[PDB]
Ligand binder design. Structure first.
Ligand SMILES: Nc1ncnc2c1ncn2[C@@H]1O[C@H](COP(=O)(O)OP(=O)(O)OP(=O)(O)O)[C@@H](O)[C@H]1O
Ligand SMILES: C[S@@+](CC[C@H](N)C(=O)[O-])C[C@H]1O[C@@H](n2cnc3c(N)ncnc32)[C@H](O)[C@@H]1O
Ligand SMILES: [Mg+2]
Ligand SMILES: [Mg+2]
Length: 413
């Protein structure tokens, strides 16, 4: 071992189980391990078993042995013979660690990966070299591939502003390397951001679950209103709203950024403590960091009224309207209003019962929202008896218009 460590061109990491070398090492390593193992455990638990882990550019093997040290079956790749020779030496000293090391290039290793081989892959301070060599677009395709064949990827990414010659080749924002992947979240920063990424699972600390589908817009036909700053992930029994407070390319203004904040805090305040006698979807998890915030809630069944109308579906307008008026009256009695009641925020189930979603639209201060509900009634459809209903409402003075009165009048023929 002694000789193998002199044979290293550089001592990059702490050498595992050998404090004699801790001054020679360029990187102290512990702060980043505690974040990596914290995520190892989360995903280990969610999968229900120990993990297969791929350590890309493993250096002197510190992170792979540290993980093998907890039942992980690891593979370590580095393109320097000297590095792996040290890795195996350390692995031989720890003989019951399931630990294997290969001399290889990340580009080829990733190219040859089959889906499921590894649950977790780790790429710390290595992709910048590859961006310099092969370019931004080639590295995005490597990382898409790597995310597709694993459940989770941890990356620590060098940034352009660093005073090295390869800095100029890097994108403006390190998020440019991973924004094409479905899910990403910043989990730390050192002296360099560290991201947890996945194309298969929502990875929040208390909510680690696969998703079947995700979208970068709220509904068919929403356009680009949120400038792609909100992501929506659909599981079996949940929906996760993930809002970025800040985006690459500077595209989100300060006001757009506040909008993402207010709307999310507000929804959480509401769903966390909803007014008695109001069936609101349950909060399964929520949190935020400096970059973003998230809310995970129970998935209501059915389809958006907007899509049912788009597909020309046969709907019961009486049942949709009554159920929707019953809950708007109910909210109103308890001092709440929804300021965005439109087809695309109404979910309709198989029995034609209608529920609101998008509860960040809730305000707690009436006629102006009733007025606007007439646009909704109009989008919904005037035949009778709904022409009479509406004229009955219009005989009252506008100041008197509210949802109790819309509902009362609607219950008379
Ligand atoms: N509880 C839920 N159950 C089922 N689907 C939901 C639920 N919450 C949200 N959705 C779906 O996710 C989409 C986005 O949700 P929502 O409309 O609440 O987000 P938003 O960010 O407020 O967007 P916008 O205000 O632009 O409509 C909805 O259009 C709907 O398809
Ligand atoms: C700066 S280090 C990072 C070490 C370790 N992941 C960490 O952060 O502690 C970069 C490592 O990646 C290896 N490396 C760089 N480019 C590589 C490539 N294309 N293929 C394989 N290994 C590479 C180097 O040999 C070196 O050990
Ligand atoms: Mg909506
Ligand atoms: Mg909304």
């Amino acid at each position: 071992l002694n000789t193998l460590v002199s044979e290293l061109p550089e001592i990059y990491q702490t050498i595992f189980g050998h404090p004699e070398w801790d001054g020679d090492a360029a990187r102290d390593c512990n702060q980043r391990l505690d974040l990596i193992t914290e995520q190892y455990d989360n995903l280990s638990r969610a999968l229900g078993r120990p993990l297969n882990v791929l350590d890309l550019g493993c250096a002197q093997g510190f992170f792979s042995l540290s993980l093998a040290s907890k039942g992980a079956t690891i593979v370590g790749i580095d393109f320097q013979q000297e590095n792996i020779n040290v890795c195996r030496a350390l692995a031989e000293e720890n003989p019951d660690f399931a630990a294997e090391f290969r001399v290889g290039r990340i580009e080829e290793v990733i190219a040859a990966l089959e889906e499921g081989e590894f649950d977790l892959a780790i790429g710390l301070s290595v992709f910048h070299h590859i961006v310099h060599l092969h370019g931004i677009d080639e590295v995005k395709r490597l990382l898409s591939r790597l995310a597709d064949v694993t459940q989770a990827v941890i990356l620590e990414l060098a940034v352009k502003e660093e005073p090295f010659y390869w800095g100029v080749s890097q994108p403006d924002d390190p998020r440019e390397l991973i924004e094409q992947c479905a899910f990403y979240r910043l989990i730390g920063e050192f002296d360099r951001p560290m991201y947890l990424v996945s194309n298969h699972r929502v990875l929040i600390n208390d909510f680690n679950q696969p998703f079947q589908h995700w979208q970068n817009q709220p509904y068919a036909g929403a356009g680009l209103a949120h400038k792609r700053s909100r992501r929506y992930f659909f599981g079996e029994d949940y929906v996760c709203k993930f809002f970025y407070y800040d985006m690459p390319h500077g595209i989100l203004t300060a006001e757009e950024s506040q909008r993402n904040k207010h709307e999310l805090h507000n929804e959480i305040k509401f769903l966390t403590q909803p007014p008695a006698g109001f069936d609101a979807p349950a909060v399964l998890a929520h949190g935020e960091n400096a970059q973003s915030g998230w809310l995970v809630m129970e998935k209501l069944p059915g389809r958006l009224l907007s899509d049912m109308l788009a597909a020309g579906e046969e709907i019961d307008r009486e049942k949709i309207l009554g159920s929707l008026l019953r809950s708007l009256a109910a909210l109103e009695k308890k001092g709440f209003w929804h300021d965005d009641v439109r087809p695309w925020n109404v979910m309709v189930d198989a029995r034609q019962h209608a529920r609101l979603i998008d509860f960040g639209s809730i305000v707690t201060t009436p006629t102006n929202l009733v007025q606007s509900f007439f646009v909704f009634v109009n989008e919904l459809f005037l035949p009778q008896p709904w022409s009479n209903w509406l004229y009955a409402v219009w005989q009252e003075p506008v100041e008197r218009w509210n949802f109790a009165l819309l509902l009362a009048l609607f219950e008379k023929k």
